[PDB]
């Protein structure tokens, strides 16, 4: 229905706003762009599902997220990919992991404060009906 289409359009506006607020935070600058393949050629071999906030925006605009749960799976993926590629005790790796964990925690905290549980539930029930 047009009412269901209006629901998913509201979800996209909400997800763009959350992603924008993460992307303008100076802590998260590294996560705003895909890994430069000329700068880091082995990334695409080690990390099987690369994800970054620019790709998250692309996926919102392509209607790939029908629930906030599906969006948070991609936020979780930025965090897990960061922990996987940068696992060492050195401060460079530890800073990336702390920033990755913070990006994930911030996304979940915004959604906890600002997502209506009944809105997510409606998205889930429209998704399941298809
Ligand atoms: C190579 C490491 C860096 C951190 N991780 S990550 O897995 O946490 C990760 C990185 C990225 N994007 C970028 O790194 C984009 N970028 C570059 O390719 N080079 C510069 C200029 C800078 C890094 C030297 C930069 O910012 C996106 C997502 C993750 Br999860 C991979």
Swiss-Prot record:
Subcellular location: Nucleus
Coiled coil segments of this chain: 108-130
Tissue specificity: Highly expressed in estrogen receptor positive breast tumors and in osteosarcoma tumors.
Domain Bromo: from-to ranges: 3-114
Highest taxon of the lineage: Eukaryota
Induction: Up-regulated in breast, uterus, colon, ovary, and stomach tumors. Induced in breast cancer cells overexpressing NCOA3 or treated with estrogen. Down-regulated in 5-fluorouracil-resistant derivatives of the colon cancer cell line HCT 116.
Assigned protein family: Belongs to the AAA ATPase family.
Function: May be a transcriptional coactivator of the nuclear receptor ESR1 required to induce the expression of a subset of estradiol target genes, such as CCND1, MYC and E2F1. May play a role in the recruitment or occupancy of CREBBP at some ESR1 target gene promoters. May be required for histone hyperacetylation. Involved in the estrogen-induced cell proliferation and cell cycle progression of breast cancer cells.
Quaternary structure (record): Interacts with ESR1 and NCOA3 and these interactions are enhanced by estradiol. Interacts with acetylated lysine residues on histone H1.4, H2A, H2B and H3 (in vitro).
Listed name of the protein: ATPase family AAA domain-containing protein 2
Gene that produces this protein: ATAD2
Range covered out of full length: 981 to 1108 of 1390
């Amino acid at each position: 229905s047009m009412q269901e289409e209006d629901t998913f359009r509201e979800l996209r506006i909400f997800l763009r706003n959350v992603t924008h607020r993460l992307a303008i935070d100076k802590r998260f600058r590294v996560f705003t762009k895909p890994v430069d393949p000329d700068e880091v050629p082995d990334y695409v071999t080690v990390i099987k599902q690369p994800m970054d906030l620019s790709s998250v925006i692309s996926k919102i605009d392509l209607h790939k997220y029908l629930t906030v749960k599906d969006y948070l799976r991609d936020i979780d993926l930025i965090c897990s990919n960061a922990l996987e590629y940068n696992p060492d005790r050195d401060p460079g790796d530890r800073l990336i992991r702390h920033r990755a964990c913070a990006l994930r925690d911030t996304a979940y905290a915004i959604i906890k404060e600002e997502l209506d549980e009944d809105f997510e539930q409606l998205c889930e029930e429209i998704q399941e009906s298809r």
